[PDB]
Symmetry: D2
Subunit: 310 residues, 4 copies
């Protein structure tokens, strides 16, 4: 009768913020933090523990090492390497593949038998890699994918239409990156057709474009302003964590393996998927219009070309 | 029929973390952030907004200016200045008093008529200053005081006795700083007398001391490890925010004005106090043993001497 | 600075269940319960108070009288009369209009200046009546409307498609009653067109029909089984209460006054509407297909005909 | 990887209220309800399901049978028989022991391997019986015990001292019944000695007595008023359910087996105990003053005498 245990690997801005989200939300009762910067870990674990008496229900937080993954239920990986000058995107992929082969190797050697949630960029490539490296079933390896992109799109639509973001149903699918796309054929508020309504406004076509540009380029915009982006990603990772531990069967946009859905295979990419205590139960195949079909196929090709090069 | 509006003044590590706590907890529906580093604000507001579609209920976040305090319900002040080399503690007090005279002045000029929650250190001095400067009733000016110290003490006791921190009732009172004290005469788990039990262990007296030292010196220890401390303070500020907006009549340890309680007057200092939608309803005067009476009086004197110098 | 105060008028199965929901959810910190059956109230208030120590945040519960509405924020009306044999619907309407004239009058005389949430059936008629009797702006008088019918439709769809109910976006609009209608033109899971998908199944048209019939006739089915229905209603009333007190600007299907929307006027009826701390901020006018336009107009006509009588 | 599954056996006012609490709180994602009154169950399950779309997170509710316990995590027993005229307490005990032997037997035969939470009165006796009949470790059989009596005591103290109930630390221990006792040596608000403070008030000894009498006799008072008590019990059962499923290591007053603690053995009785995902981790032995030691020993003797018969 063990409790719910998350191990976070990588304690930078995103991981540390996700850890604080867990302490606020009490999704699980045990959080273990692993990072090579063991002084930052020790300092963060103290600071987080001191918050926990005001957590809704008990959360225990500790510094850990790979062996602590033995009975972990979810391993969340935020660790990795940024692109350097003169490095090609292929170089950046190769560099993080080497890191992930090592991390996933150490996790599996602990006898871990839970679910992976990968957040490191490029997330769709690294989720695919974690699946291959770990030998686990596809249900048990999840990339965060477009979980945050979809939230950014909903946030911006909720400002354009002045309603709660929870009342906006809107999705970004595809690569978490340059090749993502908005699903305007479905974006709505209680049935209100948002793109059609925006097209009625003056320069409405320009507004539609700017809503998507601001979604696509959100990280770049936050980094220019404050140097790093982390709250939005932490909250999205908490949302997935919730769906798993509360066994929700909730449809979320995450990076999932396709084996025929959307006429694509052997690729991880952002799509709506049903999430529950066993991970991704199934990918949801929704209708796409011509423009969306075109863009989604191009995104998948982009991801598959990159991996093939590697 | 207006909603619940918090304005945060000061968007460093503590303020930004408190803002993220609010986005996780949905205590209030509107958060406004004010800081002279307007680029950091703009970047944080974007990053926070992107989390809000997964907030439990709607939270709107925006960058603001003093005029936005006009209809704010709670103004939370984290802004201030750290001590510099060659500066005496008196110098550090004088420097933050000048900043607070300015901030409080601008807030009041907006026609603000809500509650202040002060977090800037030295918090008991600056809460007293905010009370004087604002002209408001003492109920409506609250320092965070020992809200975090008490949580640190409970956290450490919950580790020593291996139970949920929510099942540990333990308090730190006095100055948030060197002169704080533990209330061992009351610290218990369901009636278990913790100090008495610790005294039964081998070198039990040394354990009692180390539990308090680690509480008192927690910030110093976190700063040596990761350079700054912020999660624990953010969570404590969220806890007070909750008691106010949910009208709880909850007893929390905060910095409150004494006008006769504990035989002290004309001083703000950390004590248990009943918190509700009108701020501090009353200070709770609990029995203190001789050692606690001695230490609390010395803490109050320390704070009053400092203010008198200023 | 006052806290958040709800007064419940009518402590039957629905109202008492709604009170328990409030004790579980801690949406507000004060609940006052008013009912002519003062012994049942005294009992419920004790039993409820004993739960409050485990409520997420403080909830104070007490037995009250009309004067306690003076500074209430939300007054929730579940009180009324059921239809008797040899009574027409018109008779049933008239009887409750008399009760509401009395209740709303006593509430207003207390100096109440908050929001009404009407739950008593026929809820669209009685919401309209409460608006008229109270003289308050339409924003501050809300009927529960199809808040539960919509949840029932989502529940049944969540079973037919095996997914979280929270991941089903689907709505019932119109009269809370015989003339309500499903908005199949909109009902979807992350963009999956539910009616279209059901029509691909064998006897799929029969399944579509049965999902709606089971939604429409849910209360009848529950009453036949256990003699009364109340948990669904209580939870829907708690959801509206949450949107108000947390100032959400959440779109919910409630009974709202139309003044031109959907080409209808001078009628309360179930529609998506933005709810916040001020009550109904605005009705949302969604596109309706031919079938839905037809059924919605018929529902509104039905309600206006009966009120005109 | 399985989700969290509770099976409720006994769908009376207490069990149905507990089910509604679970729908409000989303502590677990699956609830199965078993009762011989299968029409009431069918009705409650429909009404409850219709609330679930507004639950914080997915809650699936269904009508079930004993075989559904096979992979349940928690089985909550509210079923039983009330005392009849001309029946002694011993008769009442014997009748429920027969019912429990049957229920626990059918549960165990399903392959259930989780935790029992017994709520049926007399709860300390029936918790002990369930431990014996099930052959499970003591950690995995929990009676509700004084979970509600403690909340009642805190509620009344919160009224006498005008503060949040969550800020009152106070406990009732012993038999859930006539021999329960207040732990005044501990009861406090942030260190304020409540009994001492009450004794300073005029007729303060009378107030102290009345706070306890109203705690002890609460169910009687509620039954006299509205004929049954259920909200308090449901919320206490939900609080224990929360501590298990969120693995809290929370100290709660429940009915636990003593094997030496408080100098008592071979008896279940209400005591503070650490609760986590494994059930009762350990009983907490708190210091008791002379009066409390006397009353606690008497309560345990009362329970052991009746079981020995």
């Amino acid at each position: 009768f063990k409790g719910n245990k998350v191990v976070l690997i990588g304690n930078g801005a995103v991981g540390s913020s996700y850890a604080f989200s867990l302490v606020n939300q009490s999704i699980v009762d045990e959080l273990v933090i692993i990072d090579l910067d063991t002084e930052k870990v020790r300092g963060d674990v103290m600071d987080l523990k001191h918050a926990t008496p005001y957590s809704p229900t008990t959360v225990r937080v500790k510094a850990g090492e790979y062996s602590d993954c033995h009975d972990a239920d979810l391993v969340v990986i935020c660790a990795g390497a940024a692109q350097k000058p003169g490095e090609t995107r292929l170089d950046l992929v190769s560099k993080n593949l080497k890191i992930f082969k090592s991390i996933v190797g150490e996790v599996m050697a602990s006898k871990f038998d839970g679910i992976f949630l990968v957040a490191t960029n490029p997330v769709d490539i690294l989720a695919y890699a974690t699946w291959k490296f770990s030998g686990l079933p596809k249900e048990r390896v999840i990339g965060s994918g477009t979980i945050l992109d979809s939230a950014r799109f909903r946030l911006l639509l909720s400002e354009a239409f002045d309603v709660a973001p929870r009342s906006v149903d809107a999705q970004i699918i595809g690569e978490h990156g340059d090749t993502e796309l908005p699903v305007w054929s479905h974006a709505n508020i209680a049935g209100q057709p948002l793109k059609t309504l925006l097209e009625q406004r003056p320069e409405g076509k320009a507004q539609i474009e700017q809503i998507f540009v601001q979604t696509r380029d959100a990280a770049y915009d936050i980094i220019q302003a404050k140097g790093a982006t982390y709250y939005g990603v932490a909250m999205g990772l908490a949302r997935i964590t919730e769906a798993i531990f509360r066994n929700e069967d909730a449809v979320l946009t995450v990076s999932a393996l396709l084996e025929g859905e959307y006429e694509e295979e052997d690729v991880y990419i952002g799509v709506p998927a049903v999430i529950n205590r066993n991970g991704i139960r199934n990918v949801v195949e929704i209708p796409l219009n011509d423009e969306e079909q075109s863009k989604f196929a191009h995104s998948a090709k982009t991801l598959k070309d990159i991996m093939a090069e590697a």
